[PDB]
Design a protein around this ligand. Structure first.
Ligand SMILES: Nc1ncnc2c1ncn2[C@@H]1O[C@H](CSCC[C@H](N)C(=O)O)[C@@H](O)[C@H]1O
Ligand SMILES: Nc1ncnc2c1ncn2[C@@H]1O[C@H](CSCC[C@H](N)C(=O)O)[C@@H](O)[C@H]1O
Ligand SMILES: CN(CCN)Cc1cn[nH]c1-c1ccc(F)cc1
Ligand SMILES: CN(CCN)Cc1cn[nH]c1-c1ccc(F)cc1
Lengths: 352, 337
């Protein structure tokens, strides 16, 4: 009755969250998002090889695949020699995953289970967990909590986690697409005979003055200083679920290579698969120096461009967290200082 | 309500992106450029109304063509940028920028010519043509010039090779990953073809399966044209296919025509897949799933373009069609978000 009233107090927020989660899972009910993920060969091959590389530890064992999607990774586990895979999926796509499993003659080895991993009922604890949970800037979507919840509740003592860790990186960058778009108004006179160079200011406010994280792929030569690691996440680390709510990040400092128009920062990530005593640990990287992936990079624009020079000092602080309104939307708090300019603040939220 | 439909519409035109896109659209901007300049004899010393002047570029084309006065009317916040561009080009006493919707603007005089780039996806998306016709009736002098003067709509059955590759993707998964996912073709089809949305995507001429059929001609000088827009524009079509293909649906596109001047050759701005690409691309009307056609497969039906009930600016397409001897089918579309 006091107990009853306490439940009645949490009923409203618990329902809002259920409704929110349901909108998020729907983001994965359509073909395109899976098409994109499986066409991403770097992503998909890193998982396949990461799994394969651990066939010795997986032979005859059991696996939980958190967010099975179309079932692909679960099937990788089955092919690696796993006795049993529980393919858990909260989005309507679990139906396609079930179809793929049956079509591949694997319905005895892979069990597709609908609904959230947080409330799924497995018949036993598992020897390994596999999950592709990473969002833009690693933490967009906030799926990691789900994976950690599954670990604490269902992974056997000393069990395997694929992947096992993640690292976050930041570098000052120059966006060539952005530069072209800002410069476009100065080109109008030469194409059509009307001087529109006075709109550069306006173009800059629209395209750089907003507070959204932008997903764009850059290449090596857009990076204006040595990339700095700013966070390391060891997935097995006790109560890391709390660290997430409070923010993950760190401070950074670096020195620019040379003359360049600086537009802001790129952040990206990598995840590491533990290796068997075969081949060693396999890194899946989303770096602009490395083969492109569907995550690209997450771009954080300064309000306007800043010219940097060789040995220009760039430092600051970055923290990744949930947005106030949408816990599944990535927020980035950026503190930064370029050259002799004063320290500045920008508070970004993931592009819809 | 209605107030909030317009905030969202004009907010998009308040921002740089759509203007960069229209202006980087070379086929579009150079058609207006040449179209305007070749009507110098109609424009020199005359007065012009630019309906929806945006950044003011076409108004400036008009002034460069000799107009003594241009009224550049713009309902979004971008009117500030247009006034700046006008000042910067020393054109403030030739071009006057006026904020607000053309429906309620007051000009100091009736005009000799109207210019406007009012066309949306599938021609009528955004429903801006009302505004131009409203301005013609209220402000254009008897016998005045309209740039462009007319519009035409076209339809053709299509096989969209890019879509075909997206449907066939699932059959290629085994080759590279060792998992057979070819059983997901059905699901891919329902996702990419089974919805009711008009898709703005660019096609190749090689995607066109039959001779394109004109299904509407819009003569802008015609009183009464206003009232038809509400009934719907369109009518029947029929054509016969070139060869074997999986037909995915139909593409529609449009052209607009600027009268020739003294030089006397009309300039046509086309959005056909047989012509250089524009930012309008083509508007795609996918059937629920592919249908196999052969050479001389007859394709017929009826198409209506009209505004949605709940949102007057959102294009709606009502399609009725018959492929070969297959039974007649029906499908309703609304413009993509
Ligand atoms: N709490 C939760 N429980 C179960 N599934 C979840 C979840 N949160 C997210 N998901 C699912 O996890 C998937 C992540 S992406 C798809 C990964 C898929 N295994 C692949 O590699 O292709 C989505 O399908 C999403 O619906
Ligand atoms: N009823 C109305 N009154 C005034 N402007 C309008 C309008 N409906 C749409 N517009 C404006 O008309 C423009 C259409 S597109 C911009 C065209 C610009 N003349 C160019 O060719 O680059 C937009 O700027 C839009 O805000
Ligand atoms: C980011 N990847 C990998 C998720 N593990 C999913 C994806 C691929 N394309 N688009 C998405 C996506 C993007 C944003 C979402 F909220 C959900 C999915
Ligand atoms: C469709 N064109 C030309 C309109 N005269 C404007 C444009 C360019 N990019 N995107 C748009 C656009 C698209 C949809 C809208 F509701 C408004 C503008």
């Amino acid at each position: 009755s006091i107990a009853a009233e306490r439940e009645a107090a949490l009923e409203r927020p618990r329902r809002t969250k259920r409704e929110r989660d349901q909108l998020y899972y729907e983001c994965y009910s359509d073909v395109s998002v899976h098409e994109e993920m499986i066409a991403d060969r770097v992503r998909t091959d890193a998982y396949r090889l990461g799994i394969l590389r651990n066939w010795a530890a997986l032979r005859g064992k059991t696996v939980l695949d958190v967010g099975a999607g179309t079932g692909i990774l679960s099937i990788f586990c089955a092919q690696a020699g796993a006795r049993r895979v529980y393919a858990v999926e909260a989005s309507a796509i679990w139906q396609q995953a079930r179809e793929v499993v049956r079509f591949n003659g694997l319905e005895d080895r892979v069990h597709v289970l609908p609904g959230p991993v947080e409330t799924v009922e497995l018949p036993e604890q598992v020897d390994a967990i596999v999950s592709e949970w990473m969002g833009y800037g690693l933490l967009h979507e906030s799926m990691l909590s789900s994976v950690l919840h599954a670990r604490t509740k269902w992974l056997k003592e000393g069990g395997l986690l694929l992947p096992a860790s993640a690292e976050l990186f930041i570098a000052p960058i120059s966006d060539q697409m952005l530069e072209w778009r800002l410069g476009f108004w100065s080109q109008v006179k030469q194409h059509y005979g009307v001087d529109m160079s006075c709109l550069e200011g306006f173009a800059t406010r629209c395209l750089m003055g907003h507070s959204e994280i932008v997903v764009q792929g850059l290449s090596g030569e857009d990076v204006l200083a040595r990339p700095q690691r700013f966070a390391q996440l060891e997935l097995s680390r006790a109560g890391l679920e709390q660290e997430l709510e409070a923010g993950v990040g760190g401070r950074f400092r670096c020195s620019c290579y040379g003359s360049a128009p600086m537009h802001g920062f790129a952040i990206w990530f990598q995840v590491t698969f533990p290796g068997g005593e075969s081949e060693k640990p396999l890194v899946l990287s989303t770096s602009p120096f490395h083969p492109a992936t569907h995550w690209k990079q997450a771009l954080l624009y300064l309000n306007e461009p800043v010219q940097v020079e060789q040995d220009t000092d760039v430092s600051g602080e970055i923290t990744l967290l949930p947005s106030r309104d949408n816990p599944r939307r990535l927020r980035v708090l950026l503190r930064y200082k370029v050259g002799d300019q004063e320290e500045k603040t920008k508070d970004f939220a993931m592009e819809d």
